[PDB]
Amino acid sequence: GPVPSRARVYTDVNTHRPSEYWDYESHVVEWGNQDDYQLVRKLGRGKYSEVFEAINITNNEKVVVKILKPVAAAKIKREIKILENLRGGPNIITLADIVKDPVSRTPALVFEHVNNTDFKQLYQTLTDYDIRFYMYEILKALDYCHSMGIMHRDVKPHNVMIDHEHRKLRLIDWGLAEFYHPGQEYNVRVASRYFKGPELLVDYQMYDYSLDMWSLGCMLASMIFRKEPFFHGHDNYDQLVRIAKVLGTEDLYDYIDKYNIELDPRFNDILGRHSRKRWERFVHSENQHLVSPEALDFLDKLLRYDHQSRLTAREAMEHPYFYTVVK
Numbered sequence: 001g002p003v004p005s006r007a008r009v010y011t012d013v014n015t016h017r018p019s020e021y022w023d024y025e026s027h028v029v030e031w032g033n034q035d036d037y038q039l040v041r042k043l044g045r046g047k048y049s050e051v052f053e054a055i056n057i058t059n060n061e062k063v064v065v066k067i068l069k070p071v072a073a074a075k076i077k078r079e080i081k082i083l084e085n086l087r088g089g090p091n092i093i094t095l096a097d098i099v100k101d102p103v104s105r106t107p108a109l110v111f112e113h114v115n116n117t118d119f120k121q122l123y124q125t126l127t128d129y130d131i132r133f134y135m136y137e138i139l140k141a142l143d144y145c146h147s148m149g150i151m152h153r154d155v156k157p158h159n160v161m162i163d164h165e166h167r168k169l170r171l172i173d174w175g176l177a178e179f180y181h182p183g184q185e186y187n188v189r190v191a192s193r194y195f196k197g198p199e200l201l202v203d204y205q206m207y208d209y210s211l212d213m214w215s216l217g218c219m220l221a222s223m224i225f226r227k228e229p230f231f232h233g234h235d236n237y238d239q240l241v242r243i244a245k246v247l248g249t250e251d252l253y254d255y256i257d258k259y260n261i262e263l264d265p266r267f268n269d270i271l272g273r274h275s276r277k278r279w280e281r282f283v284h285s286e287n288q289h290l291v292s293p294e295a296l297d298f299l300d301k302l303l304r305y306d307h308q309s310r311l312t313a314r315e316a317m318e319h320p321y322f323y324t325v326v327k
């Protein structure tokens with residue numbers, strides 16, 4: 001059977017906290033006043049929630065209200081507990097309140113408002129300096145949540161709200177986030193197809209915080225190479241083939257051999273045999289201004305098949321790529 005795996009960092013944070021911290025099923029919700037909040041306009045819908053621009057009539061401040069569909073299946077408590085654990089962490093969306101929605105009869109999460117500018121207008125229009133700056137701000141969020149025993153599991157441009165005017169970033173949508181417990185097997189049906197780590201795609205369940213660092217590498221590659229998305233799978237199988245056409249099949253086989261993973265036999269007809277490509281093959285006249293030796297070295301150390309070999313968020317923040325960012 002598969003060889004087990006453990007994170008190389010923050011392995012035992014949860015084992016040493018009182019059950020109060022990670023036992024989200026035991027958590028009792030403190031309800032605020034639903035009458036404090038007036039919905040202004042629908043902003044978005046996902047498969048698990050509807051999001052609204054709202055006003056807090058007690059202070060006239062803009063808020064965002066996320067009304068959970070009942071389909072959450074009660075995992076509302078994990079999201080609430082994670083949001084409360086992380087509250088006030090650097091670049092973590094701030095949960096202001098939890099009220100009972102009178103219509104849905106489900107919890108409505110009240111968040112601070114970020115005046116977001118659209119990613120499809122932003123992340124493919126930023127400067128070299130701004131890519132470095134915002135990546136550093138995302139790393140602060142990821143090292144904070146990892147240090148607090150939490151993996152986000154849905155890092156992608158849509159879950160990063162940026163107020164480009166105030167140089168303000170928040171990591172949002174913690175509805176897939178989970179507490180890391182060493183030796184625990186997790187559901188591989190997390191993250192969005194283009195950001196899914198190889199561990200998910202080969203059905204390796206004993207994964208950890210390092211899944212977020214793969215997702216972040218997918219975001220960086222799309223930004224520096226101006227290619228959305230970078231790994232453009234037609235489905236979850238083709239997603240691994242797209243990765244293997246860049247990183248090569250020999251390192252893929254070494255990875256699944258290390259963890260004693262058997263590839264789905266569906267791959268025998270579609271994977272082929274691929275060399276690792278040099279990152280310079282993706283450089284062209286339209287994206288060269290965003291590419292440096294430091295950018296490629298950093299990307300190279302995120303986009304590794306072996307989840308244990310990837311930079312941690314804290315190691316990533318030490319990388320030369322960020323030396324130019326004002327701290």
Ligand SMILES: CC(C)NC(=O)COc1cccc(-c2nc(Nc3ccc4[nH]ncc4c3)c3ccccc3n2)c1
Pocket residue numbers: 043044045046049051064066093111112113114115116118161172173
């Ligand atoms: C034409 C528009 C542009 N196209 C859309 O149809 C969606 O647009 C938006 C715009 C802004 C935010 C969101 C949004 N936010 C979400 N949480 C959220 C939470 C706290 C927040 N503080 N400030 C912003 C914000 C957003 C969200 C969560 C789950 C599912 C979907 C979500 N969606 C969507």
